[PDB]
Amino acid sequence: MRVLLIAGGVSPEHEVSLLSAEGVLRHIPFPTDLAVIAQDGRWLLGEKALTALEAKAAPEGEHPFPPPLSWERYDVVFPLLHGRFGEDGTVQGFLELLGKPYVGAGVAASALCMDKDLSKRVLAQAGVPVVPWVAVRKGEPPVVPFDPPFFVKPANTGSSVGISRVERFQDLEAALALAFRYDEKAVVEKALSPVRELEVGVLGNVFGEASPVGEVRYEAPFYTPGRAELLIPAPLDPGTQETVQELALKAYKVLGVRGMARVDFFLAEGELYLNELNTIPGFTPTSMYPRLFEAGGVAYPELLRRLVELALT
Amino acid sequence: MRVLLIAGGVSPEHEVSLLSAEGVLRHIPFPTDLAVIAQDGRWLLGEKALTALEAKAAPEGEHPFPPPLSWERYDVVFPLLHGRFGEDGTVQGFLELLGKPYVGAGVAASALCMDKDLSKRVLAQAGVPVVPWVAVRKGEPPVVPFDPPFFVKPANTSVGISRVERFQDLEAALALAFRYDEKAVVEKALSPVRELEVGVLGNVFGEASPVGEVRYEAPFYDYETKYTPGRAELLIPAPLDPGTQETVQELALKAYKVLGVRGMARVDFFLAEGELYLNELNTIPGFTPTSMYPRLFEAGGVAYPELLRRLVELALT
Ligand SMILES: Nc1ncnc2c1ncn2[C@@H]1O[C@H](COP(=O)(O)OP(=O)(O)NP(=O)(O)O)[C@@H](O)[C@H]1O
Ligand SMILES: Nc1ncnc2c1ncn2[C@@H]1O[C@H](COP(=O)(O)OP(=O)(O)NP(=O)(O)O)[C@@H](O)[C@H]1O
């Protein structure tokens, strides 16, 4: 049982990706090899991979995609990439073509969960509450059936790259234009406030289990934003906490997710809304997902072992 | 401009893929090379590819994936594969990594349109009419909110599809279906129904084609003639009153735009009781110069080479 980890990626979460590879590599209960995708798309195998894993960022790589890697040597591949070319289904399909079992969501589920429009349409349809939104295709005349303020962000592009809060219905044109830079389609969502953020993790294939529920609170700026808190158990009557968990498990089911998902929720005026499912969350031993499950009773090592095994069932 | 055509595939539509590549290869108005995926999953390049085409069926290939192809030599990849590793978005996903512009639907649209459950959900939420249905996942009690009869097909695989007359039979159709896809759909058996087809062309905002109709003729023994095989009839255009033709076409365009499909699509509908029901969207249909999609567009005034030309050109958006 040998495992292959692919960290890095061409997305803005590159550094965090390598940072996660560090945690996994250290506490993973399996002989594990590393492979790195440099910011320039080139791959780094062998020791160059780890040398980069030690530098906290891999500006450039050696092998053009597809890399001359020895997929033969591995039973399971653990992708740790974010956003575009990470959890959008592209890498997953590559793996399907190579016939390699892999950790996490498959093609379809990664692509749906990555697109802010289609995933909302599926969840809405399935009874999961989502924020009132609208999709705006490039060249299509905007039509917001609700008043500002609101959020505009490209349909499917990880990290807040291209997002913006819009106050005046007039400035909506600037928002779209910006977002259009990273995607042909964009979403306009009714901005909530007051608003609390709740996080919950899921483990398992299709019918997974939910970890306890946690709340993300931000501390004052000090200009740098303040340290985000990870309150858990989150301060919600047992009622809403359960509701949040069953809602996540339900969304996890209809979308056919596999392995894991960091499900984010918005709590505004007593109402819940599922913001998004992250098929590949941050994996440092001190990241939101592993910390959530540790609280649920699953050690970092055990969590990784269960994930890798799941890639085979 | 240089185009790379990829046909064959490990799926059951392997043979039909090659015939499509044949038509495409004979009329495409651009220099085009052929790459073939044999049934064993190994690729055939250059001459071997073209030779596999001649025999119509490539049992074995020479190169394990990924193939040693000079992608750089091409401006657009036109993938002609049906089903698994064809419309599911894996090859499309592989092409995104290669950064090559390709013909047809992207990863999401391809994956989504390929799923008989997720696609209906998105279309329903969009107000597009679909046949009542419910999804059932292996090892989970079925909760069919509607009375029989009804069809049970696997969610992502035309095998395993059975017609159920009585509930006591559902467990059988399900078990039957779960031997292909971990997920299946139970649809309300609509009767009587007329099948309607319309082709869409363009990226997201397309141009519909004339509506066509499919009718089956059973095999029979003729007095003078003798045996006469079963037959599928493609009536272009469909014998419908303008209002229905109008609706079915706009309905096609509506669904095409919601799903964000690119390049092309053959949209199928069921007409029953005067109610139109969107059955499914095929992101990569047959391309024989006599397949429904190409014929539909000929009727619509777009010659074959022209249809091919526009498809390729759209790949570059
Ligand atoms: N409708 C909304 N109302 C209030 N706050 C919002 C809303 N939408 C987004 N936000 C805020 O913006 C933050 C990031 O939005 P988010 O969609 O999670 O970016 P993202 O994580 O990069 N999505 P993705 O690109 O698919 O991974 C959230 O944590 C919220 O604090
Ligand atoms: N709800 C229905 N009512 C009446 N007839 C149906 C219904 N569903 C399917 N059929 C018939 O069964 C045939 C095949 O079902 P169909 O779903 O079109 O196979 P498919 O297009 O290959 N999709 P798949 O089930 O994934 O293989 C259709 O051409 C119809 O004639």
Swiss-Prot record, chain A:
Q: Where is the ATP-grasp domain?
A: 120-309
Q: Which molecular function term from Gene Ontology is one that the record holds?
A: ATP binding
- Detail which positions bind Mg(2+) 2: E276, N278
Q: Which GO terms describe its biological process?
A: cell wall organization; peptidoglycan biosynthetic process; regulation of cell shape
Q: Which reaction does it catalyse?
A: 2 D-alanine + ATP = D-alanyl-D-alanine + ADP + phosphate + H(+)
Q: Which GO terms describe its cellular component?
A: cytosol
State the compartments where it is located. Answer: Cytoplasm
Q: Name one Pfam family in it.
A: Dala_Dala_lig_C
Q: In which pathway does it act?
A: Cell wall biogenesis; peptidoglycan biosynthesis
This protein's cofactor list reads: Mg(2+); Mn(2+)
* Residues at which ATP binds: 147-198
Homology family:
Belongs to the D-alanine--D-alanine ligase family.
**What name has this protein been given in UniProt?**
D-alanine--D-alanine ligase
Originating species: Thermus thermophilus (strain ATCC 27634 / DSM 579 / HB8)
